[PDB]
Structure 1
């Protein structure tokens, strides 16, 4: 990651962009498995093996509460959603495929955010 992503404190202006990114993910057709926490009754041993669960509703609360101090922390929470999903699920799972497409979409939106920060 670039130094600005690691080191530059997030401003209120930055948080308008973070909310835009999050809303774009929540609206994506393939974000449906990630909107709310994994239901334990759908996924045996999930909370036994996934030590740091994450979901977009939890990130929405953190964005609202100004939890993130650096962009790298926001990216880390987002990356947890996808990494957890690919850890638990087989590569032919619909969940795994959602993580693959949504992560690519996140990286596109993230690159746009970082550039808007530079100007």
Structure 2
């Protein structure tokens, strides 16, 4: 299998993570982990078995926790799939998620090609 230095993944992928963060207000619900107590939604962790958010992805990328770049792609799509699963299609959060996913799909393709 192919070997990737943590520093190579960090430098290559950080611009794509910035592209998500800079979407305002769409990234705001995704910048920190969903807090079901604060939001009053105790069933969140029953429906969403594997929570994910931008802060967790950013920490994994900054600290060298990904073995290969498709694991970062996996985490980003997990984040988006969790939001589309939990929230109504008509809801703000679902629509914000769809904006972020549109940004991500545009940005991630050339980066993954260059990482080989």
TM-score, normalised with respect to structure 2: 0.87
- TM-aligned CA deviation for residue 10 of structure 1: 2.6
The answer to whether residue 36 in structure 2 is matched with residue 40 in structure 1 is yes
The 4+ residue runs of structure 1 with deviation greater than 4 A are none
TM-score, normalised with respect to structure 1: 0.85
Question: Greater shift after overlay, 32-41 or 109-118?
Answer: 109-118
Structure 2 counterparts to residues 2-81 of structure 1, below 5 A: 7-11=1-5, 12-29=7-24, 30-41=26-37, 42=39, 43-81=41-79
- TM-aligned CA deviation for residue 82 of structure 1: 0.4
- TM-aligned CA deviation for residue 65 of structure 1: 1.4
Question: Greater shift after overlay, 9-18 or 100-109?
Answer: 9-18
Unaligned runs of at least 5 residues, structure 2: none
Question: Greater shift after overlay, 46-55 or 8-17?
Answer: 8-17
Instruction: Give the whole-Å Cα distance in 1 for the aligned partners of 2:112 and 2:60.
Output: 19
Query: Secondary structure of the equivalent of 2:27?
Result: helix
The answer to whether residue 84 in structure 2 is matched with residue 86 in structure 1 is yes
Instruction: Give the whole-Å Cα distance in 1 for the aligned partners of 2:42 and 2:50.
Output: 16
Unaligned runs of at least 5 residues, structure 1: 1-6
Instruction: Give the whole-Å Cα distance in 2 for the aligned partners of 1:94 and 1:10.
Output: 37
- Structure number with the higher helix fraction is 1
